[PDB]
């Protein structure tokens, strides 16, 4: 049982299949987890969006969509709208450190989606644009 | 390893600018800080999952599947016994970790000597 946590780079001759497809054909699920909202959007391998569901579109409100239950419901709805189009496996791309980070991830499994690759793509500026000032002066 | 300390503080013999600005004098105290309510994790989660699987599959009845009901109780009893026996075994022994109540008495036997 030789299992490597490294992703199956297309440059190699590895044979890893999910539902008959290769790792390059598996759809993507972008989960932008901000500090006040968690958006989930499902796109195909050709960068074509399939399903879109956010904590705001789930019927929540200002402080209600910041909790983890809102991200879990958003993930359930996204998984439902994705399975409505016939998808099996997905690659989760997490963006931003928010409270609904793991909730939106487990929401897809609770709504019926198989998570195979969790990629953390968080924007880390190499001292680029100057961010806002500090609070509690 | 331990980071270097030469040429860090502000002294008369140091010709460069001091690098480290200590809030308090870097003297090793004779008593460690008390651990902020060392906690533990739950138990028998995997045994409860396979137990509730019977309820979700057979429509919430215990007469259908039984071993998933007995192993759960066995895990609960073993956890209840380990919560009471280890709470004394680990406080009597010192193989692994130890509370600060003993670290303080261990350090006071061989304290630091700031003077002389």
């Amino acid at each position: 049982s030789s299992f490597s946590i490294y992703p199956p780079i297309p440059g190699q001759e590895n044979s890893l299949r999910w539902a008959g497809k290769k790792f390059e054909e598996i759809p993507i699920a972008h989960i932008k987890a901000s500090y006040n909202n968690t958006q989930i959007q499902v796109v195909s391998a050709a960068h074509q969006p399939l399903a879109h569901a956010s904590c705001g579109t789930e019927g929540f409100r200002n402080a209600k969509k910041g909790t983890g239950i809102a991200a879990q419901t958003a993930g359930i709805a996204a998984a439902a709208k994705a399975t409505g189009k016939g998808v099996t496996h997905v690659r989760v791309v997490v963006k931003g450190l928010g409270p609904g980070r793991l909730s939106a991830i487990k929401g897809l499994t609770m709504g019926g989606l198989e998570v195979i690759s969790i990629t953390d793509n968080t924007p880390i500026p190499h001292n680029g644009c100057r961010p806002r000032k500090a609070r509690r002066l | 390893a331990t980071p270097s300390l030469r040429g860090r503080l502000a002294r008369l013999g140091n010709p460069r600018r001091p690098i480290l600005k200590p809030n308090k004098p870097l003297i090793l105290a004779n008593h460690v800080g008390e651990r902020r309510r060392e906690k533990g994790e739950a138990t028998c989660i995997t045994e409860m999952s396979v137990m509730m699987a019977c309820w979700k599959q057979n429509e919430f009845r215990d007469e259908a599947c039984r071993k998933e009901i007995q192993d759960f109780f066995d895990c609960a009893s073993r956890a209840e016994a380990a919560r009471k026996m280890r709470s004394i075994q680990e406080n009597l022994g010192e193989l692994g970790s130890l509370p600060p109540k003993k670290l303080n008495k261990l350090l006071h036997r061989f304290p630091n000597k700031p003077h002389v």
């Binding site: - | 533990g40 409860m48 999952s49 309820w55 919430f60």
Partner: protein, 208 residues
């Protein structure tokens, strides 16, 4: 509080002493229990060495008793057992020879089986985390489960009956329903199990 720390619990079982030679491991502790000059508390007025009484029946009568009127709860339990026995005898005499080999008539057995059927498995504990209370599913002890199973039945027979229906008459039907697992106590137990299964995702919040 009048019993100091040196007072231990009594031992009412006569058979525990009627065979002291048949074993050595039990003799080893019984030969020192008195040689240590250990003081023993007084035998309770509700518990005796009678072979027809049961600690489960005693606990249920104590939980049913309101205030301090003990004879009222005793008579209620007697009437309940009598009604159960007579209804089972009626069902036995109104059945055929095939159902006679399956229908039981033991009131103690029916009561204990009903309690075992109504005994829950896992409960819910409110844990405060992040300023909110979450109902974490937690395994309960045997005494906790039995106490909940008895209290649910007692509360249902107290509040969910009619003024014309008596407590023994209502409990005689509740026990027969709990024996066949078709009663509101089993319904409440299944509701508890469903609410625990719906919250099992919060099991990582428990610390014991």
């Amino acid at each position: 509080s009048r019993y100091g720390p040196e007072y231990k619990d009594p031992q009412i079982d006569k058979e525990y002493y009627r065979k002291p030679l048949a074993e050595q491991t039990e003799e080893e502790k019984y030969e020192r229990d008195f040689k240590k000059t250990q003081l023993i508390k007084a035998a309770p007025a509700t518990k005796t060495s009678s072979v027809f009484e049961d600690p489960v029946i005693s606990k249920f009568t104590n939980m049913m008793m309101k205030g301090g009127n003990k004879v009222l709860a005793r008579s209620l339990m007697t009437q309940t057992l009598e009604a159960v026995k007579r209804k089972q005898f009626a069902k036995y005499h109104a059945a055929s020879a095939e159902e006679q080999a399956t229908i039981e008539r033991n009131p103690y057995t029916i009561f204990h089986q009903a309690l075992k059927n109504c005994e829950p498995v896992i409960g819910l504990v409110p844990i405060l985390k992040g300023g909110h209370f979450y109902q974490v599913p937690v395994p309960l002890a045997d005494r906790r489960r039995r106490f909940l199973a008895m209290k649910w039945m007692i509360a249902e027979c107290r509040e969910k009956k009619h003024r014309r229906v008596l407590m023994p008459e209502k409990l005689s039907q509740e026990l027969l329903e709990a024996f066949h697992n078709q009663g509101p106590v089993i319904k409440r137990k299944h509701d508890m199990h469903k609410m625990a299964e719906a919250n099992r995702a919060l099991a990582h919040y428990r610390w014991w």
